[PDB]
């Protein structure tokens, strides 16, 4: 029963039909349309263009069109080095890849005059690099300039996450210049183009995959906040091993991990009634909305416990251990914040994820914290 | 303090602004503009004659002078002087001062290569040797035959990088040399604060007015105002999930039910119940996670009831209602 679901985990898209119109001159060897391909994240958009060019290169005339990933540069030189790697040649590399005018000499081909288009992968690392109008916008500016006179032009295909980048362009560039205009976006496929690809990615079909309307149910009730349904099939591939482990069932398993302690399991964290007392003690110190030290909390803990004698006053060292019991369940977090007297000195400020509405319910059942409120 | 504000203005998008701006700057006062340009054309032989005396020529005046300098330097002067000395004509090295990315090292590395490398000047390249290397250039040039070999142009000399003081003194030592003619323009009203009697001794500036009331097309690009957020988050909503449009629509209604300030906002509990009422929000976490996406792109605010409020104006939210949400 393994080998049917061993193969489970692994032209084709209805977005490739768009881009061949957008590359309408790429089979007639002319300069194509003006390509700035954006997208909200997770939407397949990195592999989307990679699907096109791999279908382009396997289809396509002299054949040399290269694509490089802009991740580890922070600087516009070695991209123009990596276009030279499809030549397998040798030259003086440093000057030719550095200046704007130095790129222009690089664009005279050798063997058969096939035009070249570059593909700039993950442009947002250089967009969201160092300060905008100094280097990175200038880097954006310099690449999109295609004023070259022969039709051999370095057509850009760049990609980005967040859609602020168009308004970042200068008003000269927004005057119908370069690869600007066609701001081709990709809205996140709800279930209406992505699930059908999963259907065709079920070409080798086992008998019991499961009831596919539940798969349709999975698609409809994941599409609130999602972009990657194969990865959201990779959460089905984990639950398909659950039915192997036991020889949207799992989204139900995963949300109760996150929703609880405020409604119900707050009292699970405080089986000690003193842990209930010390939890209200933190919030009474939160009146002075300050750097809530473990000492200022201990200050209000003593000066209240001398008034109402519910228990004896305990140690600060005990007060250290008891607040860590509050910590490991995930209620209150402790951080070493800032005080700048001698050096960067670290006093510990706490923060609570509970509200007084979710407090007042669980304390009226216990009239021993009622003196303390 | 009832003040009319730029937020309370009929705003204009990107393509609408720049096109009708391009209509005015190429059709408003066209006839008198070239009519000025023909009048000042007769001054061009006068500039040629004085510039043989090594005079740093400086152009002030209202309006952009960028087009005028490039006509005067490139087409008129630079072949006229090459013909009058007796072959490629005189090299023109412009300096775009409105471009803030001008440094002192890079432009001078061009200069010593533009000027003659007759000696091993890379030996004196050592750590600031720039004033050192130009001093060895100056005293050698005192005993050379007097002829211009280079004319440089510095547009917008009060620019964001050229007005820095270690760059200004660098240009001061260039101007005392007789072989190079220095034709620059500034635009500031406090431009003669830049020079003392030390530098102007090295400069021997003269002045001329040019006022053509040009629009400064290139010089407007780097500059920005609030035309260039209410407009920022106007584009993110155009690419999201369809549910975020609806949960912002229910957000924007009761936040405009009551400028858009804090007081018109809503509590988190009831808004969870309201977005539970239309079968949208499952709980607090599923609400907040796709509300952090409105938080991450700074599209909504929260202050303290637990009030979440939109920081856009009263007029803006109904514009966000009828256009992008609907």
């Amino acid at each position: 029963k393994a080998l049917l679901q061993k193969s489970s985990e692994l032209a084709r898209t209805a977005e490739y039909e768009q881009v061949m119109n957008f590359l309408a001159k790429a089979i007639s060897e002319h300069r194509s349309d003006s390509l700035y391909i954006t997208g909200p994240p997770g939407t397949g958009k990195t592999a989307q263009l990679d699907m096109i060019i791999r279908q382009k290169f396997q289809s396509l005339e002299s054949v040399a069109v290269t694509s490089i990933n802009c991740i580890s540069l922070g600087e516009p030189s070695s991209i123009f080095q990596k276009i030279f790697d499809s030549f397998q040649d040798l030259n003086g590399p440093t000057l030719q890849i550095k200046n704007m005018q130095h790129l222009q000499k690089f664009l005279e081909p050798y063997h058969k005059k096939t035009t070249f288009v570059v593909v700039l992968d993950e442009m947002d690392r250089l967009l969201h690099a160092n300060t905008s109008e100094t280097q990175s916008v200038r880097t954006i500016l310099e690449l999109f300039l295609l004023a070259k006179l022969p039709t051999v032009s370095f057509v850009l295909i760049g990609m980005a996450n967040s859609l602020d980048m168009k308004d970042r362009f200068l008003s000269r560039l927004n005057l119908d210049r370069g690869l600007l205009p066609q701001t081709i976006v990709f809205q996140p496929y709800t279930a209406e183009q992505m699930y059908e690809i999963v259907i065709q990615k079920m070409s080798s079909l086992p008998t019991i995959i499961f009831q596919p309307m539940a798969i349709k149910f999975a698609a409809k009730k994941c599409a609130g906040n999602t972009g990657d349904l194969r990865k959201l099939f990779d959460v089905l591939r984990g639950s398909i091993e659950i039915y192997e482990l036991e020889k949207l069932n799992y989204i139900a398993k995963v949300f109760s991990k996150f929703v609880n302690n405020n409604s119900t399991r707050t009292r699970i964290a405080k089986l000690n009634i003193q842990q209930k007392l010390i939890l209200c003690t933190i919030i009474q110190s939160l009146k002075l909305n300050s750097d809530a030290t473990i000492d200022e909390s201990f200050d209000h803990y003593i000066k209240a416990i001398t008034k109402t004698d519910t228990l004896a006053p305990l140690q600060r060292n005990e007060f250290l251990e008891i607040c860590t019991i509050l910590e490991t369940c995930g209620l209150v977090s402790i951080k070493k914040t800032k005080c700048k007297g001698k050096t960067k000195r670290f006093v510990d400020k706490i923060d609570v994820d509970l509200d007084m509405r979710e407090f007042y319910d669980e304390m009226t059942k216990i009239s021993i914290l009622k003196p303390f409120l | 303090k009832s003040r009319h504000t730029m937020s309370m203005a009929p705003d204009v998008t990107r393509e609408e602004f720049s096109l009708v701006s391009n209509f005015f700057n190429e059709n408003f006062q066209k006839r008198p503009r070239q009519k000025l340009f023909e009048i000042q054309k007769k001054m061009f032989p006068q500039y040629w004659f004085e510039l043989t005396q090594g005079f740093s020529l400086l152009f002030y005046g209202v309006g952009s002078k960028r087009n005028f300098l490039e006509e005067f330097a490139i087409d008129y002067l630079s072949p006229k002087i090459a013909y009058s000395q007796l072959v490629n004509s005189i090299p023109c090295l412009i300096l775009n001062g409105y471009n803030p990315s001008c440094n002192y090292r890079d432009v001078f590395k061009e200069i010593t290569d533009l000027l003659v490398p007759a000696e091993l000047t890379r030996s004196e390249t050592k750590g600031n040797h720039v004033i050192l290397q130009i001093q060895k250039m100056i005293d050698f040039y005192k005993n050379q035959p007097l002829d211009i070999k280079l004319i440089l142009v510095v547009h917008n000399l009060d620019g964001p990088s050229i007005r820095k003081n270690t760059f200004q003194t660098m240009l001061s030592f260039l101007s005392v040399i007789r072989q190079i003619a220095i034709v620059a323009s500034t635009d500031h009203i406090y431009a003669p604060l830049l020079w003392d009697n030390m530098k102007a001794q090295n400069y021997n500036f003269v002045f001329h007015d040019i006022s053509n009331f040009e629009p400064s097309t290139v010089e407007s690009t780097f500059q920005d105002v609030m035309k260039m957020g209410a407009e920022g988050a106007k584009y993110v909503l155009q690419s999201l999930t369809v549910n975020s449009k609806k949960m912002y629509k229910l957000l924007i209604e009761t936040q405009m039910q009551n400028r858009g300030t804090q007081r018109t906002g809503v509590e988190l509990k009831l808004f969870n119940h309201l977005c539970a009422a239309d079968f949208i929000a499952s709980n607090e976490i599923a609400l907040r996670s796709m509300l952090r996406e409105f938080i991450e792109h700074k599209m909504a605010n929260i202050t303290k009831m637990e009030i979440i409020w939109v920081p856009y104006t009263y007029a803006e939210l109904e514009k966000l209602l009828k256009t992008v949400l609907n």
């Binding site: - | 072949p79 775009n96 471009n99 690009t221």
Partner: peptide, 27 residues
């Protein structure tokens, strides 16, 4: 077109002679 790139170089009298005998002599 190129004006946003900084510092791009490019490679494109009976009366006055009586001045010329006077000017340099003064200098």
């Amino acid at each position: 077109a190129d004006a946003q790139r900084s510092h791009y170089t490019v490679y494109p009298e009976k009366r006055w002679e009586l001045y010329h005998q006077l000017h340099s002599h003064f200098h």
